[PDB]
C-alpha cells in the first residue's frame, strides 16, 4: 500500500488528519495540549470482514 515520507502531510496529505478532518486546513498545526484522557474497549465497526 501507501508510502510516505514522514515529516509532512501538511503539504502532503491533507487527504488525511484530524485537522484536515476538521477541514481545518493547512498548518503543521498545534495541539495546545490540553485535557482529559480516553480509551475504549470496543469498536462497533460494521464487520471488517463483512462481505
Amino acid at each position: 500500500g501507501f508510502n510516505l515520507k514522514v515529516k509532512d502531510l501538511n503539504g502532503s496529505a491533507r487527504g488525511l488528519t484530524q485537522a484536515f478532518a476538521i477541514g481545518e486546513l493547512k498548518n503543521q498545526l498545534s495541539v495546545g495540549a490540553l485535557q482529559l484522557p480516553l480509551q475504549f474497549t470496543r469498536t462497533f465497526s460494521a464487520s471488517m470482514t463483512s462481505e
Binding site: 503543521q28 498545534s30 495540549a33 490540553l34
Partner: peptide
C-alpha cells in the same frame, strides 16, 4: 506544570 510542559514543548517543537 503539565499543561505547561506540553505547551512549552509545543512551541519548542519547531
Amino acid at each position: 506544570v503539565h499543561l505547561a510542559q506540553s505547551r512549552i514543548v509545543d512551541q519548542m517543537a519547531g
